[PDB]
Amino acid sequence: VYLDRKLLTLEDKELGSGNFGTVKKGYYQMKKVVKTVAVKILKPALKDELLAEANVMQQLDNPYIVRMIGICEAESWMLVMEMAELGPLNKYLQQNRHVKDKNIIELVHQVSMGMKYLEESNFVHRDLAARNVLLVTQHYAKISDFGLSKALRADENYYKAKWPVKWYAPECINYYKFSSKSDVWSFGVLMWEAFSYGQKPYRGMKGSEVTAMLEKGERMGCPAGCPREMYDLMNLCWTYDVENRPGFAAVELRLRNYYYDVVNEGHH
Ligand SMILES: Cc1ccc(NC(=O)c2ccc(CN3CCN(C)CC3)cc2)cc1Nc1nccc(-c2cccnc2)n1
């Protein structure tokens, strides 16, 4: 886990900023190769949050989840991760409107593979949104940002708790219950965002109006140009009943098969 500050070189320019601190690009000297890294650098509770985040990432190993290199206590506490050069998915798609539907399916399918793994691992992400999907290439997505994530108890399939309300399942709001199934609800919002080239969901609406809309069985409409199959999958993820909502094994299989259909169409 613990890295040597002398082997880490940080760039002056920042990639992002917020209340927690900053994200910077850097280099870490590995056993032989040098490795480009993204480094979350902290501004009592905050240290514990970062260390909890590191504890979760330590336990994960999947091609579609961002890898932690380790942590370092220097000028500030730092979390050192592999770099995804193209950055957050929503910003990428906003800037690259030529990205084709097939390519979007490919990316969201990769996210569903990472989330099928996270579900198998019994961790709940709790912040699954397009902003937290990072692109290694235009054809390779990874899930990031495990700051709100929780390891489920051996005897329960949910964690009982601001909140990113527009990505939250109704039971998260009504009962404070977070499960892989609530992450599936968030994944439906993520799909919507991706097929909307990074537009924010529920435009112009307050969180409380989104909760009212949802309780009435109402849902965002189909993004321009979005395949009906993918919109149907968003609706499936937005199943109000937790038991009937698909888990990620079912979601991933639907996407996998549709992606194969589109790959076939392309060959034709
Ligand atoms: C290549 C790149 C370009 C930009 C960013 N940006 C960010 O990490 C970031 C951080 C905070 C915010 C918060 N925020 C303020 C600005 N606005 C309006 C959006 C919300 C947004 C983006 C990351 C990367 N790459 C990258 N690669 C690997 C890992 C990470 C990474 C980022 C954050 C947490 N954990 C891992 N990040």
Question: Technique behind this structure?
Answer: X-ray
User: Helix, strand, or coil here: 2?
Assistant: strand
Strand partners for 80? 39, 70
Resolution, angstroms, 1 dp:
1.6
> Is-contact 137 90, C-beta < 8 A?
no
Distance set, CA 167 to CA 138, 182, 189, 231 (Å): 24, 9, 6, 16
| Domains along the chain with CATH numbers | 1-83 (3.30.200.20), 84-268 (1.10.510.10)
How remote is the CA of residue 60 from the centroid of ligand 1, in Å? Answer: 20
The sheet carrying 87-88 orders its strands as: 87-88, 133-137, 140-143
Active site residue 232: no
* Burial grade of 118 (CB within 10 A; 0-12, 13-18, 19 or more): buried
> Is-contact 82 30, C-beta < 8 A?
no
Pocket perturbation via mutation, ligand 1, pick of 20, 23, 162 by most ligand atoms within 8 A of CB: 23
Count how many Cα atoms sit within 13 Å of the Cα of residue 167 in the half-sphere of its side chain: 22
DSSP letter for each residue of 155-221:
T-SEEE----GGG--HHHHHH-EEEHHHHHHHHHHHHHHHHTTTPPSSTT--HHHHHHHHHTT--PP
The amino acid occupying position 117 is Y
The H-or-E segment that residue 113 falls in is: helix 101-120
- Per annotation, catalytic residue among 101, 127, 145, 261: 127
Neighbours of 168 (CB within 10 A): 21
> Is-contact 123 60, C-beta < 8 A?
yes
Rounded distance, CA 53 to CA 249, Å? 25
